[PDB]
From a paper:
MJ0927 is a member of the Nif3 family and is highly conserved among bacteria and humans. The crystal structure of MJ0927 determined at 2.47 Å revealed that MJ0927 folds into two interlinked α/β domains. Six protomers of MJ0927 are found to form a novel hollow cage-like hexamer, in contrast to the toroid-shaped hexamers formed by other members of the Nif3 family. Additionally, we found that MJ0927 is a DNA-binding protein exhibiting the ability to bind to both single-stranded DNA (ssDNA) and double-stranded DNA (dsDNA).
Two crystal forms of MJ0927 were obtained, one in the P21 and the other in the C2221 space groups. The Se-Met labeled P21 crystal structure was solved at 2.8 Å resolution by using the multiwavelength anomalous diffraction (MAD) method. The P21 crystal form contains six molecules in each asymmetric unit, forming a hexameric spheroid with a 32-symmetry. The six independent molecules in the asymmetric unit superpose well with pairwise root-mean-square deviations (rmsd) ranging from 0.222 to 0.310 Å. The MJ0927 hexamer can be described as two stacked trimers, consisting of monomers A-B-C and D-E-F, which are related by a two-fold symmetry. Contacts between molecules A and D, B and E, or C and F occur through the interdimer interactions. The surface area of each subunit buried in the interdimer interface is 1207 Å2, which constitutes ~10% of each subunit surface area. The hexamer is stabilized by a combination of interdimer and intratrimer interactions. These results are consistent with the previous gel filtration experiment showing that MJ0927 exists as a hexamer in solution. No significant structural differences of the individual molecules were observed between the P21 and C2221 crystal forms.
Numbering used by the authors:
A (entry chain B), B (entry chain C), C (entry chain A), D (entry chain F), E (entry chain D), F (entry chain E): 6 to 249
Write the structure that this text describes.
């Protein structure tokens, strides 16, 4: 399989114009997309560890959820230097599907919507992120589900009592900034995401929004793992995981 | 019946303050507002054709939905020369009611809402455009109405199954732009508008918003026809459609 | 009770970061928060009257809902001079909790929501302001409550008939601007707030949104009285109202 | 002789790209450039008076220094309706050379310099406007050369004692701006231009710049006449002034 | 005499509209422009120290060169609280002439350009600040003038030889920022101003501009001193200085 | 010789804070600055050719005048990928002094001022770039000094005839863009720089400035050669040239 083969498959599943404004998705590093690919590695972050592990395990196509750089640079030293050296020396391709993999059909968010069997889900945000629907069940049933498949000990901000069949909002990753709490407060009863700060915790309690912090890692990995199966089940490649 | 009176009647049906920020509504071309109006001509667009047919039919007050120019200019050459030429040579007044007609009670958007008999309809966008409510029927009957009343073969992106009594958003004109689509996907099961783009279609299929494109023309001309009947009913003068 | 204790007590109830962007909340005028406080006066507005009255009453901590200044200055002349001269000459502390008091749990907006016993209420705006939920009753029952507890002769714009159990939006203060109304029109059947312009009236009529103008004063002062009681029930302090 | 060739010729004398930023130079109103021209009028501005006179005289190419519209418009009524009316019914072409004609070799600004017999003259402003140099002579011969050839009675601000052989900056048209004074005060002893607000006057005195206000009309038409003579001489077809 | 006349006098020498863009000139803290004035004070800076001294000396009109605030504020605490409390308890008026006093004839910049008898002294910057002219002498003479009148031990940055009869630029106050140094370097050989940052020194050595740091206090208080006398020689007023 | 010592040397000569706003100077690609340097290579440009010759001729420190990237990037493919690879497999350090090397004492502009022996030469622009001064000589003398040392067959725009002892302006590199041409024409009789656009030609002609285009290669390489010898004189290690 050529590099371009894989990239085409991915991009058909997670088209690039799904990506929110400014998101650095697609080819991060690479000079030849005709190159044949023996091993594909999959990670959350293109960290220095992941890059080294990739080269050690002989990965020649490195796919990561996060991009190598959010903000552009024009000077190459420190960590970024090291990351680039390895990738280029070993001719490893780094390719990224960030928000487009979150937003796409059956993507990271839909995976959470599907997990909780959300009735009539809709996107949560103006930019396509997150899903929101009714959870046909009790709050504790929802809690169990979170504990069983997402993250075993989630911090809960019980801001209000929660009736059966409540509106569940889910966002894979970092979804618990203040602006996001305030926004989702209009649209839901419970908000399942990751990275609750004290300020945001107070805010949630003030507006009556029930937050469950399953952390950014766990919600991402859950979707990413199913993307691995999808990758595995549809491609001949040896595919391994480096972050999970 | 003077021109200013006709203007006052229309401005009473659709007040100018209803217009979205920026819209160029009102007196487009014209100097003598006391001038007695003999034949009123109504068209969707003040194209070079319409402005010629106005000259041919002795139209001396020309109403359009679309304004003459979106963006100002300070040089007069090309088509716009020709347009202003035919208009000032024959002292034909040109007047437009644009998004104010899209937004007012029983305007172009209400026209659509009324046609599908939307249960508890409400404005779709923050600026007052579009309507959204429950369609008390099958997706099928919605299709039937659309075909029967608006456009005979709409392109349809059946992004997922549509259960009976679905939420239908409607927008007359060019409503199928990427920004629109993601926003409407939060609020509706089915979106009826015109002018689907490739990028727009993909967002829709991915987000699960079923989209129905019946062109900017067909969706606008429906409400515009009702507007003509409305003018003919309340105003004693001949009114021709130059455009439908 | 020291100044800084009262402030802590107020800020624990109405956390500052709740405030909307740009809001001038907190300490308005003061130098020694360690000082001792005998008499706390509470007002809507830090008007010249309120400040004049404050001093003659021996109020040494003056709380207001509105900040002393929305827009900053670098010159001290006329009215603002006269206000500061008093506050300073008498070392009277001036401190506001504005939209943070509008937004917090059991704040000015939650008060109204509870007055009307809204069913499953949620915030109205992206920034925490307003509450919206179902009013389990008839429109008439709803007006009688408005008349009894808020303002005896509210102006009503009956743009549409209102069925029982309608969706009711409430916004304490100045919530009846053209942009506000366009927005709430998407989300409510009836909008209860204060201060209607003629354009806002017409716009509400075109969109189908029934507006009840109960004045900005009446909708704010209802909640402040609740806040005053709460303060009285919690502080061993003399608290008087300068404004109501 | 055709329109384009007249234009081709004028752009020869004054290249369009010489013009300052955002200055509206070139074709103002015109349909067709293969139109054989008969009479060519010129004037400073395309006022209504100039434009009626141009039609009256059967002028079919109207050259103006000042362009028709500075800032652009998308509505056509009032004075601009009238102007655009006359030019289009009588197929009259309107062309402008504004700052390019102020700037080019032997432009209106060189004209003031050439006439004033200046020592080693150079551009006065960053954008190519004005000329500055030494006047071999006295103040008095200078006032005289002005009264006789420019404006028979100028207003003099005698900020400073002026000595023979001085720095004389000249600027054709409006150039007594409060900031044009501040700047020209660095770079000359005497400023010669047009239209002195009492503010500009007081400033120039305060800084020691000697200003001589010969109005905008006088100093602009001086150059224009030469351009007129430069025009009639080098081309066959007849050429009148409509403004001087 | 009365406050509003003192102010009318100061604005007779120094128009407020002479001051550069955005400068906070005029009344700083004042309510009663018809207050009879007994004891005028002049200071460079309205520090808390000066303001205390004004109340202790019984000053009832405080004139400073620098404004009380450059940036507008809407809260009042700490230092500004203190300055205001004293200025308002004692009803002391604070008025300021800033760059208007720097720019006027015989202002703070002309003061320097006369100490050094500069020949043909012109404005330095585009905003009217500063004076530049040929110094009819030797660098040595220049520097001895500087040490006697302005400031005794000025830091000199001299990277090359100043000839005789050179371009001297003077700026009262702070004129030794980087970008100004780059700019005076195209226009003078020597540059007398205040406050040299290290980065600025380096820049001056590199570009060949000879810089004399005379402190900002000294280069200002020189011309302030001509003022205090000019003011004393024209008013029946007790006039004392609180900063010199 | 450690890399940091080499760097600290260059920066002593041409300090970093000398560079114009936004100029990407300093370390460009490099991990280890303690690295020992056996062979320094210098070039005008970090072109792909140059980076290859550096690897070929065993260069372990590459100094360039021009930076590797002016505009930031966050994707690594194509040319930039190739440049980066060679520098990072081979651990070659890329470093640059750009406008700081044009602006520093005895930098690239001074070198030209040196070569033409300009009388009391000063910075041309506000940013520190360029040099202007009296050329105590004849024009044909100037031409010969130019043909001999800079570039053999200059392209010359003789717009006006030149007196001996004229003002000469030099700018190492790209300096013949229309905006520059207008500025310089205020300040100089002849302007010597590189890369003359046809639109810049006419502008100079019409403005009456003499322009001598000796390409940007030659004008920069002249002072680059002097800088190279300077390094040699003061430093061990072999210093080769890669562009000249």
């Amino acid at each position: 399989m050529k590099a371009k083969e894989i990239i085409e498959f991915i991009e058909t599943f997670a088209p690039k114009d799904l990506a929110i404004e400014g998101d650095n998705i697609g080819l991060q590093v690479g000079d030849n997309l005709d190159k044949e690919i023996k091993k594909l590695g999959i990670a959350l972050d293109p960290s220095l560890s992941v890059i080294k592990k990739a080269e050690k395990e002989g990965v020649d196509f490195l796919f990561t959820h996060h991009p190598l750089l959010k903000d552009p640079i024009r000077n190459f030293t420190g960590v970024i230097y090291k990351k680039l050296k390895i990738l280029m020396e070993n001719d490893i391709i780094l390719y990224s599907a960030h928000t487009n993999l979150d937003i796409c059909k059956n993507g990271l968010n839909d995976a959470l919507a599907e997990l909780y069997n959300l009735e009539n889900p809709k996107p949560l945000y103006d930019n396509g992120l997150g899903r929101v629907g009714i959870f046909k069940g009790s709050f504790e049933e929802f809690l169990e589900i979170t504990k069983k498949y997402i993250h075993k000990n989630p911090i809960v901000v019980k801001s209000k009592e929660v009736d059966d069949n409540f509106k569940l909002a889910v966002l894979s990753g970092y979804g618990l900034s203040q602006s996001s709490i305030k926004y989702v407060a209009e649209k839901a009863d419970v908000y399942l995401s990751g990275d609750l700060t004290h300020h945001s915790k107070i805010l949630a309690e003030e507006l009556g929004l029930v937050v469950v912090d399953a952390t950014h890692y766990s919600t991402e990995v859950f979707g990413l793992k199913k993307f691995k199966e999808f990758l595995s089940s549809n491609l001949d490649l040896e595919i391994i995981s480096l972050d999970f």
